[PDB]
Paper text:
Itaconate, which is an unsaturated dicarboxylic acid produced by the decarboxylation of cis-aconitate, is an intermediate metabolite in the tricarboxylic acid cycle and is a striking example of a small metabolite that regulates enzyme activity for cell growth and survival. Initial studies of itaconate production in fungi indicate that the decarboxylation of cis-aconitate to generate itaconate was catalyzed by a ~ 55 kDa protein, which was called cis-aconitate decarboxylase (CAD). In mammals, high amounts of itaconate are produced by macrophages activated by lipopolysaccharide, which is a major pathogen-associated molecular pattern in gram-negative bacteria. Our structural investigation of [name] from [name] (bsIRG1) shows that bsIRG1 exhibits the typical fold of the MmgE/PrpD family containing two distinct domains, a helical domain and a lid domain.
The 1.78 Å crystal structure of full-length bsIRG1 was elucidated by using the molecular replacement (MR) method. The structure of bsIRG1 revealed that it consisted of two distinct domains, a helical domain and a lid domain. The main forces involved in CXS binding to bsIRG1 were hydrogen bonds formed between the sulfonic acid moiety of CXS and Y269, R283, and L339 of bsIRG1, and hydrophobic interactions formed between the cyclohexyl group of CXS and the hydrophobic pocket formed by F93, L408, and L419 of bsIRG1. Based on the structural comparison of bsIRG1 with IDS epimerase, mIRG1, and hIRG1, we noticed that bsIRG1 was an open form, whose two loops (A1 and A2) were localized to expose the active site. An in silico docking simulation of cis-aconitate and bsIRG1 indicated that C1 and C6 carboxylate groups of cis-aconitate form an extensive network of hydrogen bonds with D91, H102, K200, K266, and C271 from bsIRG1, while C5 carboxylate forms hydrogen bonds only with H151 from bsIRG1. In hIRG1, Y318 performed the role of Y146 of bsIRG1 by interacting with the C6 carboxylate of the substrate.
Numbering used by the authors:
A (entry chain B), B (entry chain A): 4 to 448
């Protein structure tokens, strides 16, 4: 009669992710996307606030701060590197997680790898994603609806499990590490729209790393924190659901492959990517523009735009969650790029165009079987001068599983910030599973 | 201020605790009890596990680790000193908090006072207790019953508010710090019976200190984390209750005075202190002993022993939550002292005596008007040869508000560990509000 805590600890401990060629390939691509997203945010001012904070605390310079040209202590690095990866909303997402797995897991593993077992990082990454996906599937819808932020609340446990795999924790050590992570698990969706939201990823990475370090120190703790009427799932979610779903069909195929990580080509809310692809198609094929369009209708399935909470953004940052701003920015001839999603105010011409973009809801159109997320689509319809219309539909955006990034796409995202030579050195280190060389290259200056 | 977050921030910011002579006296006594509890646990092996961890991380030696003879970084010191204060269950309790306020608040304030504003520490301590008491009152009974550990889940916000008062944060900065603390709030009762339970106090102190440092760094965050249907009280407790109770009659009377901190004379669960007082009375006045007692009946009102979850402890640590062990230990002629509540096994003779002690429940006996906690009493009845019985009743144990420690009790608790001359110098520094000298003394080199 094995409880959920022991069940998860055993599944993690005895995993053999390196036996899956596809999962290893996907983990290498994940390291490259994580690096690209972190580099693209290297000038974000929140990073400097956090660097001044940890410099005031002090710490041994052991782990690189990605893209920042310095090192810091392991737990400090986990906080910093999680924030950096998530700061621009340019990092990866996972449909099971309903959140951002690599921004939590990879910082924890970077801190572990800088200090041993780096030969297990890729496998640990696969296992970490496996846990976070399954936690997201198991916790229940009410968890997010009530106000918890999955990236934070499930990230600490997933990071503890990834690092626990990497460091070859015993069954008892891993059970305790899971409980040490669960008893720190936190993060509130009220922080959305502020830089505390990406900081949740760093604090979750830090909490999971601390959980492993406590277990390795022989610190005492519960071995059954998932179990019972006061266990983690009863407290934060749906324990019946977790009992049915958490461990079923563990591993191959790994969740990092199926349903798979989605690597973003746009630095804004994944829920706007369909519209972004569609309007770009219309601008390319039909030469539409803000000047020649009277107005726009954006068609979602009911609830498809729930994450796009900004209908009248004033800032590029607020515009990250506005399908109106995404479409209007493209119609005005601008790239859907990092520089246009900052705290600077949206110019008045684009705001005028935003006022001519409306959302409508279509409960009859059947989503495509390969849609990401499942059941999602978006149609963009432009109204031109003489009553003419044109439309484009996207169900699986570029970068999502089923519409994967090309070789060249990965290189392009990496070279947003660094020369071609740097990006190629990074790619080669990752291809060779040379984690020491990877870590050396991603520090930058 | 309008809304709960702004309201609490304003209540904290504009507090004038220094106008309350009684509150200042109580805060000084709380500092001395915190110090004595921390000193008494200085040999705890968990402390060395945590010291090795933070030494591996590194940090500037800025803040004393109480009783350990070294300094560490502010956030590290908060973690260490909260653990140290709570490690033996010898630290203070508060009925509104349903938890251990000083083990959270004083570590955060020590880290803040070591870097300035030390003249505000005593006031900040009062304000911190005010917040944690009100959170414990406002969150609702279901919070603890569901499985959350109030010391952990309410401590970060209380510590952020104490340090925010000490460092004179603005209204906006305090609103943000409250949210930075709330979005980290965590801690599960499944960790009871392990040293992770006292570590919750340090992790809460650390999270509250981080919240203040983020607000001071101009880090972005929600200013309304208590408010709305995804706010802290809706997520973790009873938002209706909090709307009625959180801010009402603030600071009048200060909760550190009424109902007041309880300073323990025994290093075990407060709920056993009545029985401890009673059995000692019986041993003193009637010369009962393990040898001449057939059996014991211990009488509680319904629910009075709910916290005493161990009826058949195997170790002194488990014995901390066993009225049977407390009574049996006293009957066998041993002091109710730190050395008898360690992880070492309970000897077979004491276990035999434990088997002769039964709990019974009396719903008719009226608690005394001065009972602490409200409605609580304990009667100890000893059955001797020839059918004789003797009984002793305790309603307000020594150390509880209304039956406060003498000066001599305070010095005795301090000298469990250090010579009388050292303790007198510590007390003198606290009496004069010489916080710098106090901080110098409690490092123990």
């Amino acid at each position: 009669k094995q409880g959920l805590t022991a069940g998860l600890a055993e599944a993690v401990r005895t995993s053999q992710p390196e036996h899956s060629v596809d999962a290893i390939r996907k983990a290498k691509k994940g390291l490259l996307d994580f690096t690209a997203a972190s580099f693209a945010g290297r000038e974000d001012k929140g990073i400097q606030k956090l660097l001044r904070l940890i410099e005031d605390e002090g710490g041994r310079p052991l782990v690189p701060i990605i893209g920042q040209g310095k090192k810091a202590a392991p737990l400090q690095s986990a906080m910093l590197n999680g924030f950096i990866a998530h700061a621009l909303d340019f990092d990866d997402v996972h449909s099971d997680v309903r959140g951002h797995p690599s921004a939590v897991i990879v910082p924890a593993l970077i801190a572990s790898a800088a200090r041993g077992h780096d030969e297990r990082l890729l496998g640990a990454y696969i296992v970490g994603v496996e846990v976070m996906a399954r936690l997201g599937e198991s916790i229940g819808s009410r968890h997010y609806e009530k106000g918890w932020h999955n990236t934070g609340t499930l990230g600490a446990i997933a990071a503890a499990c990834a690092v626990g795999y990497a460091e070859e924790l015993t069954q008892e050590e891993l059970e305790k590490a899971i409980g040490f992570a669960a008893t720190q698990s936190a993060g509130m969706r009220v922080q959305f729209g502020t830089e505390m939201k990406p900081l949740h990823a760093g604090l979750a990475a830090q909490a999971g790393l601390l959980a492993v370090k406590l277990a390795q120190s022989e610190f005492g703790g519960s071995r059954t924190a998932f179990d019972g009427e006061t266990g983690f799932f009863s407290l934060y979610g749906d324990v019946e659901k977790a009992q049915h779903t958490l461990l079923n069909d563990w591993g191959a195929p790994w969740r990092i492959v199926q349903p798979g990580l989605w690597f973003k080509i746009y630095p804004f809310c994944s829920a706007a990517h369909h519209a972004a692809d569609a309007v770009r198609q219309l601008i390319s094929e039909e030469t539409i523009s803000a000047a020649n369009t009277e107005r726009i209708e954006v068609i979602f399935p009911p609830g498809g735009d729930a994450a796009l909470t900004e209908r009248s953004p004033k800032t590029g940052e607020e515009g990250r969650f506005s399908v109106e701003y995404v479409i209007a920015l493209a119609l005005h001839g601008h790239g859907l790029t990092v520089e246009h999603f900052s705290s600077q105010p949206i110019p008045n011409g684009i705001q005028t165009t935003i006022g001519h973009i409306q959302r409508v809801y279509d409960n009859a159109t059947q989503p495509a079987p390969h849609a990401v997320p499942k059941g999602r689509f978006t149609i963009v319809r432009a109204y031109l001068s003489d009553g003419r219309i044109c439309e484009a539909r996207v169900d699986c955006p570029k970068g999502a599983p089923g519409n994967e990034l090309s070789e060249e796409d990965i290189i392009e995202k990496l070279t947003l910030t660094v020369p071609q030579e740097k990006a190629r050195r990074i790619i080669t280190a990752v291809e060779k599973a040379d984690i020491k060389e990877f870590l050396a290259h991603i520090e930058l200056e």
